[PDB]
């Protein structure tokens, strides 16, 4: 099935040729184009005003790279290094240490935000949902040093909101 276009001879009727000559002299469908421009002129614009009327989003949006901790508990990460194994730009830098009691935990947890490409493979691979893609997007930095994060930065970034992330996961846990 094909539908090939631009095949006509010009119809040489007197009425057809005087309509096309009037189109040549008066620029008629040019005025029809002006009519379309007025028809969009007399609408109302679908803009948003930026600080006061924010644009919509999705529940599965991937921003801040925060960390969760347990319900009335401590750090949800184990340092199991699956997020480094799936992080494609190798932005995850993890050097673990077991803590002062014996249970396996971290020392050096680094998300190189200059290298992160915002997939969610660390969101998929994380077997306890410790690392979570955050909701918001204001990094917006006047320096380079403040882009690269550390463990206490990410945990302060996860202590600024939890029920945000818990609400998004409770919306999204059946699908992913």
């Amino acid at each position: 099935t094909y539908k090939y276009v631009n095949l006509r001879e010009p119809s040489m009727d007197m009425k057809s040729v005087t309509d096309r000559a009037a189109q040549t002299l008066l620029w008629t469908e040019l005025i029809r184009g002006l009519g379309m421009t007025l028809s969009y002129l007399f609408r109302e614009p679908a803009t948003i005003n930026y600080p006061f009327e924010k644009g919509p989003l999705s529940p599965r949006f991937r921003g801040e790279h925060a960390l969760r901790r347990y319900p009335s508990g401590e750090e949800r990460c184990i340092a199991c290094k699956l997020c480094e194994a799936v992080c494609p730009a190798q932005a995850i830098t993890i050097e673990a240490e077991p803590r002062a009691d014996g249970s396996r935990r971290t020392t050096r947890y680094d998300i190189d935000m200059t290298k992160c490409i915002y997939c969610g493979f660390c969101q998929e691979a994380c077997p306890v949902d410790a690392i979570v893609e955050g909701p918001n997007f204001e990094f917006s930095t006047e320096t380079h040093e403040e882009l690269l994060y550390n463990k206490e930065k990410l945990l302060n970034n996860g202590d600024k909101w939890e029920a945000e992330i818990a609400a998004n996961i409770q919306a999204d846990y059946l699908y992913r």
Binding site: N49, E53, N136
Partner: protein, 75 residues
């Protein structure tokens, strides 16, 4: 009125959903399109930075951040 006349543009108070600590105001309408349901009015000197002018994003608390980016339907 000069508050909102030189804040940005609006006069559209009339739905009055509520406010939150830092004083900030949140108004949800159904009469407009999808994109101007929920709008926010920022107060003055919420942390001493004279935020009548030079207003920032994320001067909102995060529960209203989830409410206002159109991820839920209830405040």
């Amino acid at each position: 009125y000069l508050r909102v006349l030189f804040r940005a543009n609006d006069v559209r108070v009339g739905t009055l959903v509520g406010e939150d600590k830092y004083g900030n105001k949140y108004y949800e309408d159904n009469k407009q399109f999808f994109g101007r349901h929920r709008w926010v009015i920022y107060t003055t000197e919420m942390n001493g930075k004279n935020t009548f002018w030079d207003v920032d994003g994320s001067m909102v608390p995060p529960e209203w951040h989830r409410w206002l980016h159109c991820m839920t339907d209830d405040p």
